[model samples]
Target: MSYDIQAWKKQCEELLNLIFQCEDSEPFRQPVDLLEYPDYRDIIDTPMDFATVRETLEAGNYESPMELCKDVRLIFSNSKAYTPSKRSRIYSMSLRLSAFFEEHISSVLSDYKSALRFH
Candidate 1:
């Protein structure tokens, strides 16, 4: 097993912790009108449901964690606001953590592609 795999797994674990911690931090409350902030669902919802990524991290079953990272990136990318002022601290932090997973995910994907040859 390469150290790269171990490092990627650690990043995945960090993302899992962030998801759990953020989800648990939600305070009890009702919709502020009909606006329930559904846009953030990807972040606070079942954020780590990518079984491929999970199993790959466990056994290298797939090419990379690209699937996992993409889902997370959508949590922020899907939002309409592009400015930092429009983003909350938690949102910013989540994106930063997402970046870590993404960085490793891209590395794995790049290596996978690099080793492949069309024959």
Candidate 2:
């Protein structure tokens, strides 16, 4: 089956916005709410390392951000079946989002650092 790249891209954008909103709102009871995600936490804790970035990318099925967002939506929608509590959903979503941000942020930081060093 052919994937709808545009649809996935839209989903990704929406998910990204949600993530940012969550971060801004400090929805979770944490100093850095966004860092609650294992993927995101790893990035924040070890931004220079490749392990977290690689793991996050691999865990998200190696899909593009758009596709991964779709996966996250599906996973979250069905999460209630496996986890009865809202806290679980929040934690799970955070981990997945962390992974997403880790890869993208790492890449951006890497490029920025390289540019700075080159200049």
* Best prediction by lDDT: 1
- TM-score of model 1 (CA atoms): 0.41
lDDT of 2 by residue, 1-93 (tens): 133332333443444555556542132212333434444443333221122223444465444553343433433333333334657645566
The C-alpha TM-scores of every prediction are 0.41, 0.32
Backbone clash numbers for all candidates listed = 0, 1
lDDT score for candidate 1 against the true structure: 0.45
Colliding residue pairs in candidate 2: 40-98
* Candidate 1 error regions (>4 Å): 1-64, 78-87
Model 1 C-alpha lDDT per residue in residues 16-93, reported as the tens digit of each score: 555546542222111112245545454343332333334545675434456556654644443323224545764555
Per-candidate Cα RMSD to the true structure, in Å, reads: 7.5, 13.8
RMSD of 2: 13.8
